[PDB]
Each structure stands twice: as structure tokens, then as C-alpha cells.
Nucleic acid binder design. Sequence first.
RNA 1: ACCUCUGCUUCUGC
RNA 2: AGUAGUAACAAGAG
Lengths: 704, 749, 250
Amino acid sequence: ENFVRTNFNPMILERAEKTMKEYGENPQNEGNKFAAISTHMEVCFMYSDFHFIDLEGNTIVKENDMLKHRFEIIEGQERNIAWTIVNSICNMTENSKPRFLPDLYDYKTNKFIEIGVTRRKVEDYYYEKASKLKGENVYIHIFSFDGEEMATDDEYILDEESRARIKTRLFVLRQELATAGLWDSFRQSELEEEFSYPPTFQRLANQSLPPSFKDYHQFKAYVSSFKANGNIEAKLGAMSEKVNAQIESFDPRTIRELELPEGKFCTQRSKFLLMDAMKLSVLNPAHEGEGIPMKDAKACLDTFWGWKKATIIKKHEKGVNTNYLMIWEQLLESIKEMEGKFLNLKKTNHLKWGLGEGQAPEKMDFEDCKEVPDLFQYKSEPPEKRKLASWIQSEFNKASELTNSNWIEFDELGNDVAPIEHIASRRRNFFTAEVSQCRASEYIMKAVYINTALLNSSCTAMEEYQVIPIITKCRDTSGQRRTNLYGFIIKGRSHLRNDTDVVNFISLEFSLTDPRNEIHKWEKYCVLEIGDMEIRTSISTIMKPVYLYVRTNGTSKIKMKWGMEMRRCLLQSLQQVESMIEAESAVKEKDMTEPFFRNRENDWPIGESPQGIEKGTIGKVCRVLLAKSVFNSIYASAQLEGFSAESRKLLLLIQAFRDNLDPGTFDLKGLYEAIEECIINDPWVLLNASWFNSFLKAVQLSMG
Amino acid sequence: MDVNPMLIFLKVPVQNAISTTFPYTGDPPYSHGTGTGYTMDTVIRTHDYSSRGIWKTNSETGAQQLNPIDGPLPEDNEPSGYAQTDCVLELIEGLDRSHPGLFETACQETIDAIQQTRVDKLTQGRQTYDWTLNRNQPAATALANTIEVFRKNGYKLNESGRLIDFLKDVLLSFENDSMEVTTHFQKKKRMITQRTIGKKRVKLTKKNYLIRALTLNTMTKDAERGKLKRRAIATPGMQIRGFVYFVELLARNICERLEQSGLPVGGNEKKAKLANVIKKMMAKSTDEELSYTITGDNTKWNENQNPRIFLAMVLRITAGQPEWFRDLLAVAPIMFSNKVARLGRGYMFESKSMHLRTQISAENLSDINLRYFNEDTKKKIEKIRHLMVEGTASLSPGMMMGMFNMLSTVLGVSVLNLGQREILKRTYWWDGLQSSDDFALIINGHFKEDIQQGVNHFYRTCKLVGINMSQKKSYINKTGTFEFTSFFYRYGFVANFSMELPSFGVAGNNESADMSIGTTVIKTNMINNDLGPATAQMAIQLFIKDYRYTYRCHRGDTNLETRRTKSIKRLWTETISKAGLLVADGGPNPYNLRNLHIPEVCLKWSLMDPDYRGRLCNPNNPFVHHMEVESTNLAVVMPAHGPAKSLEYDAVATTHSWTPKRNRSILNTNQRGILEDERIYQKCCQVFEKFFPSSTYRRPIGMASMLDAMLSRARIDARIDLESGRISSQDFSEITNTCKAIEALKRQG
Amino acid sequence: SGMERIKELMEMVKNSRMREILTTTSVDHMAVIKKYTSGRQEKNPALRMKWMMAMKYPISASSRIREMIPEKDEDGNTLWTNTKDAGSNRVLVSPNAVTWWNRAGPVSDVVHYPRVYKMYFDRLERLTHGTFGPVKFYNQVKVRKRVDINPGHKDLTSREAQEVIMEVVFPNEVGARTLSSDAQLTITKEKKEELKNCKISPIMVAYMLERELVRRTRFLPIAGATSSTYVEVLHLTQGTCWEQQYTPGG
RNA sequence: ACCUCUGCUUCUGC
RNA sequence: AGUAGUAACAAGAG
Ligand SMILES: [Mg+2]
Ligand SMILES: [Mg+2]
């Protein structure tokens, strides 16, 4: 290998090293192909060099270069750039592409040249190259170490001095190969994947076996020669009979109910008031700056005149309750004094308390605080259990009722052309007439508005205490626009990094409900009595006190992102009702939408009175499934996720009994434990567990 | 009347209203803080189900390793990891006997795919643990960091470009006693002060590098539905991804031809397979033959399958193949048998009297006073301290990262294959479908005690091979109804629309892509998930509203006020044909049921003003960012269940095909030099694509450097444009002199 | 014209780090460092888009926008900024920049768009001239069966389609891949005639050609005809309980 | 305390 | 305080 590194020129060494590295073999190992490729590249470069094309088109054998070359070298390059060279040449002229890669290209004759440097007879290798490379205009030009040549059709385009230098250099290299004693092995030499383990990985492989094996190759020989002879049956006879999947017969008449937890009553945890909310309205708003939320808030605020000096009538027991009073007074004073489209509050002390400014501990390093006597890790206690209270059922009752306003305004659609689009338009209009005046649609509008405004304010004003009015816009039955104000939200600082990062806000919501009639519902609220208004009724007209429910609440980026998308509750309700319509339409072989929505018979069980199971119409089913999806979105929790996933199996087992499909379990007690593990303190999960118990009692009465 | 929606199931069957049991309109549960406790819980549980195994100290890493294979048989119905090797080999032998030629053809296809795979196939992946940085990186930059550290340390077989030479370099790098990596630290000096970050070359030991190469980075699974408590997941490093690739390629070629395998098929194909197995198991041999179906779940699936069993499976499937191929496929269970788990970010400590908080790492958990912790964490750390090896926990049993999904499917399909009538010759037989964790099992017999004996036979055979059927979550009934991966079969598959409800809404790519994705999602759910026509119309309306509010592109005649109102209003007033404006430009919605399959630019093309159409479809626009043909019109969607999918949409590239800005937190960290490295890499790839325009379409191959290839291309393009009238002779001479100057600069430095 | 790129190449090789990268990175390894990023793939793009569209400058555009559009519009909205996107040379722009381009940017010629995006315009041509019949309600018997979803493909595999696209879009860089079939020669001649002087990006042209010339299949539940022009409108014709009678155009 | 930077980036796998 | 729930946020970094 030292002869090839000594006699040949280093550019030929570089070309041969690139060729062998591209082909995987090595000059240090296989050196016969190394010296053969080096001699081939030497002959090809002596063919190519010192041949130029002038500014007329004649070969002037010069030694200095402003004339372009006559030959272009395609041998020795990488294969992809060589095929790029060949393809650009053939697209420059008009010639068809050859099947193999040649060695040179002559721009004078416009021809691809092929050169093979052999260690045997010139004629045999030339006839081999001719029989192989047949079917294309390739000028084969075979040389050898004998100082002779063979060409295609006896057309010799290379000049006499270049061929004389080629033959002289080949004879000199043959004499230097023969005097050095390295010449016969050239005439003697004229899917193989390997993957073994190096020793550290071999010792790693020896320690990753079953325990009766010490060598990895011993284990390979065992696995390759394994024949089964009843190993499974022998270990099945040897296994204890306490490993079994015994089937317990499932019968809903004998199963127990879910055990709902004990403790204090569950409290309200929604981000705004639901059945207890009170709105100040402006009918057909047309004030200056209408559309801007603070302008609508001042316009709806001017409709109320019965303000007083606000007093605390229900205290938040863990809070500084006079701070909430000062917050409402500062907010009202700043609304009366504002001159713009937005409102940022001063960072007073009571507002800083209510928004939790400075409540994060100072972030330090561990060695700087190692010796603190009460440096403890964070409290990771389970949630405290709560009892089911009566208010969440009445909230769900009011959420599925009809109001007097349309709350959903849908965007425009493309025009109906197909008949199925007209069928879909009639069915969608039936569902919209059954669902747009529902109170859960009003809750959708409140939540989408609040979460949209809170997310935009949290992104754009991270250091500001922005005031966000709680505004919906509805239409009456006469079609008149109405703007409703429910109260205000004061945002805190909102440097929201993680998706679970909390922005604290203060909710201040109008109400007519006295909180002392149901105080366990309001354990997070400080309720102020802010005024009096005249409610006019059928008996007389009475001055009711107007209350303000003030609360510190918090939301995250992911929570208000999901609150922004609460209109998909409509899709869930409409999809279920439409699948129920289409199931009857496939049977009756006609469209069943108008018989469903028009025939006002009570034929769907949707409730219970003391007189038994109550039935309703399909529009009641629409509003009830809508309110269920809305309350799933409002009271979303991991408890609800676990409860729904685990109680679905009990529902499917009851359905399997009612289909006479003979249901059976393997561990019903573990299933009941997995259901009851998820019922902790969330009022909606407690109501859903009570609902499962009521459905189970109704099934047990329907059977027996 | 107190309203109860569950009473709807008194009239409607539960499967026909099953969407009222999926509360998927609210936010999913998320974890806060670390996942160190979930990771330590996983390691403690994995060692508890295998505790009657044999402990051995590893000679190469020092890790305490538990071996439950061929251990004592289980004595109760608790989850156990005592899989028997001979039972596994008997089941794989039965799977080979029932499918003759399957293993040999899968092995031959894997052999043919090994010789054609390049290293850049490892760029396709999510967050890979980077042993160079001891953190998570994207898969391509983790691969680039590994290749760079390997080339700096003398491992350069991967310069051939194929994957198997990179794998040879990975295995040969374990012989290094001093692998040299580069870290980072800040240097602040100075009357105004400037500060930058300088590199520092560290040298790992042999044990340090071997522990880093076998490290899984653990974190918490977020946004998972159906559970009360969070679980931990793991991502592996770059040293094992290439071996896991070939093992999963073999197991995918096996699972594609098993009709009892639920992998790797979509929803409709899995429903077709379940319908076929229900039709086969209800053809009835006699007339009084019983048929029962187990709606099954497997408890602690990943914590009880063992890498040594997977090693035996790989060596038995490949029986009769070349030994290099057997060793190469055996590397990945061997490296999973010696794996260690990184224990997360640690914990936060709080001082209430001094009002401070601090973050201790998981490396500090081995040497810290136990008085800081609560009782659960204190018990976890005391149980975990004997498994500790250099900041990581030793985790020999179990499959924590869970990458052998198709191999676990092969193991479950072998137990399903055992229950043929011609193999068992019993009074019972079984069949079903296996999709990794989930399984359906139809058991047929003549009496109910035959059904119980078949259930016990299946359950004990699964216990012999480390498969633990969940008795709390499984139930049995007569064949006609079951559930499989939230697919509810009640004499036919029913619709479960609530599973697809998070996919409705704005996808979050750009305006054009999200319009295409939203209409395609509505169309796909109309075809597959039985979305009705009225609900599809309302879904179009709700998507258009969420799209207008998300991108602030309300209609030009409306009276809202955003940052984009005045500009869209100017475009609205200057437009003659308003119906040709896109929704992103303040135009009307064109979509109904019949045209959801038509992109919005084509649907409005004949209605556009020609000037607006020329501005909107201008190819010389600075907003669009074409990178690669294979990534064109691709989004990554994350469904409510399952891993993230690649979704193809149909969209004309306009000025609404822009890209959002990147996260900028790296500028405050030590890794801000990665930005400069990425910028230089993008500039080099841009000038290479100036020389080689097909590189954006077909990946160019070559062992020569980029500069040499560009110089050769410049030389041939000059000679081809000189002899064609395109380029003069002085420009040719200037190009050749510039190439010679570039060669001189290359030879200089 | 290929003289500016070699000047840019010499200016890059004059820098030491770019020279070290271009001399150490092979052509095959450049597919690895092409995808080098600090930016990770977004795991919640819906929430991230809702959070970013509230920002002032959430869009990254090419820096030449600073010469293309003004810094402010007629309303005084800042359209672009000088701050760079992370790990890139792109600057941070406003959505008002996109609206300004759509109402007042350079008008280009769009006669190549119905030829490049012909697969998309064929769907609208089939829908516009389609005939709707009556809706029939009955139990639909759908069969989950693998059909094809590419109305108007050419019977070419991925290798043959790759050869045709390489002969049409990038004709000098095909390598050792000659067009074996005469149908491929017909598609190549027709597409080189149609897609001539095309200023649409070659990435989009190669993408649309690959979407056109390759037969693609899906697993769908079909109740009636399984032809690819009927699978194209499968959401429109069949339902769970209804069938819409429809014949497409052509 | 002023000022600068950041808002998925020490933490989202198959 | 509040969000929340098995660990965090209640700004982080310089
Ligand atoms: Mg709460
Ligand atoms: Mg299951």
C-alpha cells in the first residue's frame, strides 16, 4: 500500500480514497483494487489534462490556461454529481442518456469516453467492454500495461503526445510494480452484512437473560433449538387454583347504590353566577361608542338608580371582608371617573390583597435556605370530601328551562342546493327553536364572553388590573337587540407561563338572591347589599334589596381556552337528538323530524317527581342534554372524568342485563371502589352519582 | 320535578346514547409541578410485582437489577411479572405453526429494509432525551448532537449515511473510557457590563456514559381523559431509538398479517376486523353452542411485560435468520433490560415563616435529609434509594417507555391463537382481537361451565406470560355487545361522536390550513362517526364563528373592533365582488354540506376580484414558508385518545399560509447558542438548495461534503450554460475563478 | 444565470464557522442538520394560536417584507418590526401586514393556478355540473371496504411518479432513472407543456403532481357505488338513514 | 429600587 | 386569600 502512496500523485490518492470510501472497502485492507483504481484514475487524468478548446474549436495541447477545457472528467467524482453532469450534458445537446456512467466526455466530438486499465490481454477486455456496453454511443478506449491500446471502430481522437505519455507512464509503472515484487497478484485479482457485539455490550447482553443462563449465545442456542412439549399445561397444573377469573353473575336488583361521601355541604365553584344572576339591560342600545364593553357597562349601569352605601351582609370567613367593600367602592368610583374605552384600576392595598399580589414565595436556591427549620415540601393532601347539597339539582333544573330571549346567534351558511341540505336546514331550525331560548345557552354566552375577554386581557395586559364587564347580547321574541350587564371582573397580574398557571380575578356579580337562605352554597363569597330596586309583579310592586356577590376566583390558560369553546355543547346535544331522529327515520322510511318536534307528547323520561318518573317532549330532551354538556364544561374536573369512565361500565352491565345477555363480572367490588374513589367534593360529580343511584332505583322498580 | 338525564336510558339503550357518558366539552386534567412522585411510584410498583425475583448487581453500570423471569408461579390474582420463558416460546411456536411462512417473510422484509434505511429516518420523532445535554430535545437535533459528539470522539462509521453503521458506532462507543461532551456556563465581566456563555468540555467516565445511554427521561402524561390520577410516561435517548426502529419494523410486518391483531390499522379497518371476528364466532357449529364476549382491560400492562421475554420472542421469531440480524434485533431488548429512569425535575420546598420556595433536583434525592418530605414521599424515597445510580433509578423489569406496542400485540395474539378448536381439543375455544393494552375475547362452548373453564384457561395462560387481565375493569356477557378502544358494538358499531368533539374547532396552524382542517374534520365525521346533516351544518356555523374570533377576521360589514378591523374594512370597501373574499379577509362563509371537500380558494376563485386574486396568490410573497415537499400540507393533530397523528389537508398556498412566531425563552437560558447554530445551518441549507433545487423534493445522497458538491455543480452549470447561449465567456471565467478561490479558501483553513 | 450564488458561496466560505460546517457536513448528513431546531413541535396548537393571536406581532415573515410593505399603514398600525424570530432571519409581523398585502400588495399573474391545482378545481367542476335527485330514507347497509380516493389519477407507482415529477420539475437531476413507459412520456410531455414558465414554487408543483399522479386508497363505509367520483362526495350522498341521489359532472 | 429579557423550552413519549 | 389537588400557581430570569 506504500507503493501506491509513494509513486502516485496525491490528487489521484484523494480520488481513489474517495472512491473506496464511497464503495465501503479500504485501501489498507483490499489494496489490489486500490492500486487498480489509482492506475485507472492516473490514465483518465492523463487522458483529460492538457487538452483545451479555444475560441474557434480546435484542440491546442497547451500547458498554461483563457481557453476552456476539451474533456470533462466523470470518473472519480461522487455518483450523484456525476449523473448530474451526464444529465445536464444530455439535456444541453439532444443525445439520449447512457445506461452506465462513463469516464470522460469530449465537448469536441460530443461523445462519452470509457477507459479500462487492465493487467491482462487488451483484446479480451476490450471485447468484454464492447459486449457489455453495447447499445449506446460510448467510445471505449481500453489501455493496458503493454504500451498499446484498443478503440471503437478504429477512430482515434486522442493526440499522439498524450497517448505517448500514457503508454510511457504505464510502462514505467509496470516496471516499478514488477521490480518491487508486486505484479502477479494483480493478474490473480483481475448481503455480506456484519453486526457483532463489542465486549462491553457483550457483557451487557450476558446479564439480560433468564436466570438459568450465563452466556448470551447459550441462550440463543436454547431458543433456536426449543421444541414445545406441554410446558404451558405443566405450568398450568403446577399453578395454584387461587389464580382464577371466576365469573360472578350480575343482577341490578341485587347490587348496591353508590356511597356518596360525608362532610360539609358542597359549595358553588362556578366562575360566574348561574340561576342567581341578575342583569341590567338596555333595550335597543344606540349610545355613543356602542359595542365597546365599558360603554355598554356604563349604559346598563345608568338604568339602575337605587344605589345605597354598600354593607357586608354575608362574610367570607377566610377573607378580609372590608377589602371587598373597598374594592367595590374603588371600582364604582373608577367607573364614574373614567374617560376612555378601557379601565385599569390603581394598585391599592385591598385590591392587591384580593388579587393575591405578592402571595408567591420568593424563589431561592436550596443551599441558600437549607437550614430553615420549617422548610417543608409542598402540601400534597387529597381534597377534603363534601356532602351533596340540594342547590346543584335546582341549578340544573333552571339550566334546562326556557327563557324569553334568544341567546345564540349563528353565523351564515352557504345556500342550500341539495335536497338533503333543505332537510338539514329544517331539522337544524327545529333544534334551534327548541334550544336558543334555553338558559344553558345563556350560560354558554356568558362563559364564552368571559373566557375570551379574560384570555385577551391576560395576554395583552400582564401587569394591569383590567376591568372586564360581564356582557351578553340577546334578542327578544319580537327580535329587538338587548345588552345585559351581569357585573364585573377585575383581572390580576397574568404572566401565564405554563398552561396551568393561575390568573387571579375578582368577580363582582349582581343578584337578587339573599345568600343567608342557603349559606353553604356561598362559602367563597362575600356578599354586599348594594341597593334596592322595584320588582313589579301581579300582586303589588315591592322594593327588593340588590346584592353583590364578590369573590376571588382564578383561571388558567387551558381552562379559559376550553371555556372559549363552550358552543360545542350545542353540537353534542344536537348530535344525540339527531341520531334519535334518524333511528326512527330508518324504520318509518320517511323524514321523522317534524313528527318528532311537532307531536308534543311526553314520551321521554327526563325526571322524577314525588308522583314518579316524569316524561317530556323531544325539545325538553334537547335542553336537558344541552344543560348536561354545559355543566360538564363548567364543572370540569378529574373527578368527573374518572367517574364517567368508571360508571360507564356499570351502565353497560345494566344494559347487558336488560338485553338478556347474561352479564357477569370478575371483581364488582373493585369496580365500585374505583367509582367511589372519584366522588370527593365536586357538586356536579355528586349530582351525577345521585343521578346514577336514581336511575338504578328506577331500573330495579321497572324489573320487579 | 328534579331533572335526571340518566333516566333517558330507561327508553334508549346505553350504546345508542353513549355520548352522554363522555364529558368531553370541558378541559381535560393536567398535572402541575413535577412527575418525580409518579415516576417513583412506577419504579416501586414495577419492583413490587417482581419482588420474588433474583437481584443481581450489573457489572457494567453498577445498577441493582431485578430478574422475575422463570420465577415462582403467582399465588393470587395480584398483578405479577413472573413470566415463564418456555411458555412464551411455546406460544410463539404455536403462532409460527398456525401462520407458516409469516416469520420468515417478515424477517426477510426487515432485512431488505435494514440495508436501505438512512440515519435521517431517526429525525422523525417527538421529544427525544438528549444524553449530550441531559434533557429533552427534538429528534433531529438530538440525532445531530449525538452524531457530532461521536465524530469528535472518533466514531464515524455513520459517515456512510446508513442507519446500521450509526448503530455500529453506538455499540462501539460503549468501549470509550472518556467520552468528551461540551457543556455551557455564563461569563459576566465588564463602565458597562456585557455577558455571554462559553463552552466547557467535560469528560464522562465509562459508567457515566453507559448510564446516560440507557436513560429514559420521565415526565407526566397531560390532557389524558378517563382517569382521576396522573401517570408517568418516559422517552428514551438516541442510542436505542435506532434499534427500537428495526424491532418495531419487524413486529409491524408481523402484525399486519395477523387478523387477530388490532395494530397498525385505523378506526374503520379495526371495526371491519371486529365485525369479521364477530361474524366468524357467531356462525354456530351446533344450535345450542354458547358464545360469550369479555370486554377486557389489562391492569398494569407496561409494568409487567419484561425485556427478557421480548428478547426471547425476538430470538424465536428470527430463528433461522443470519446471526448479525438476530444480534441487531436483540440489541433493543438488551438495552431495555439494562435501562435506568431519570427521576424528573425533583421537588419544590416551601418555608412559610420565611416565605420562600426552592427547587431540589432529583439528583439531590439520594443525599438529602428526610425531614423535608411528607410521609408519602418519604416512604417513596426510602423504597427507592437502593435502586439509585448516579441521579437515576435502576429499572430492570417492566417496560416503562412502552415502545414495544406491536411486539406486545404479537405476545397477546399468541395467547389468542392458542384457543383454536384444533389446538385445544377441549369443550371450549376462543378468538378475538388484540390492540396492545386492550383486548376483546369471544369464548365459545357448549355449556356455561365450559365458558368458565375457557375464561380460566385464558386468564392463567396470560398470567404465565406476564399479562394481567384487570378483574375490576373486565366483564363478560353473551355475544352481541362489547366495547373495544372506546368503540361500542351493539349488533353493529354505534356512533361515539363525543370522542371527536375536541377535534372540532380551530386547529391552530394558520388561517388557510385551519379552514381546510375544519371543513375536512366535519366531512370526515360525516363519513365515519355518523355525524348527521343538521349537526354538520351547525358545526360549519360554529367553526366559522370560532375561526372569525380566533383570527380576528370578522365579516367586513360587521361592527366589532379588533386590531384587524380597519384594514379588513378597507379591503371590504375597495372590493367589487364581496363573495370572492376569503373568510380570513373578512368575506362570507361559502360552505354547506355539499362543498366541504373543496378548498376555499378554489371555491371562491371565479368570484374574486382579479387584483385581489393576484395579490392573494402571489408566489413572491414574504408570508409563505415552503420547506419540503414531504412536509407540505401537513398538520399534527392530537385526538382525545391516542398519540398525535399527521393530518393531510387540501389548501392552495396563499398569504394566509404563514407561520407563527417561535418561543423565545431560550434567549434567557444557557442554550441560546443553539439559535445561532440553527441560523447558520439554515443559511447553509438555503445556499445548497440554491445549487440543488431538487433537495426540497427528493433527499440528496452523497458521502462528499456540501461545498465540494456545490463547486462541482457550479462547474458543470457554467460549462452547460456557456455552450447554450445563456452565459457569456467572461461570466464563465469569473465563475471558474470564484470556484478556484473557494477551493483555495477550503485548502487554506 | 448562476453567478450570484457562487459569490454568496464565497462570502459564506470566508466565514470560519460556515466553512467548517460546509466542509464537515456531507450531502447525506445535511438532511439531519436541515431539521436542526430549538423549537419543538407544538403539543397544543389550538390554545397556542388563541394565545398568540392576541399578541401584536405573532407572525414570522421573510425579512424582505421590510422592503416590500411599509412599516405602517393608513390607519397607523405597525405592520412589521425589526425583531427576529428565534433561530431564524425572519422578522415578526402583524396580521395587518397580511391584510395590507391582500388589499394593496403587488398583483401577480395567476394563470398557472388552475393548471397546478387542477386536482382541486376538478372537484368543483364535478360538483357544479352535478345533478341532484331525491332523498330516500331507509336502513343504509354500509360496508367498511378499501376504495380509492383519487378521481383522475394516472396508474403510476411512487417510483414512476417520482420519475415523472423529476422529469418535469427538476429535469437535470434525475440520475440514472430513465422513463421506462410510454404513458410516463405522455404525462411528462403534457405536464412540461402545461407547467411552462410557471412562477408557482416548485415545492407546490411537485406536491400537486404527487397528489395527482398517485392512486391513494382509504378504508371507508360505502353503501352504494364505489367509484372514485362517488367516493369524493361520500359525505353528501349517503348517511345513516338516508341516501341522496347524485350524479357528478362528467 | 431602576432597567433589560421571557409567557410551551431544565417539563408532552410510543 | 384564591385557584387547585397527590404539586403547583399565586411571576420567572438577568
Ligand atoms: Mg374551586
Ligand atoms: Mg377494554
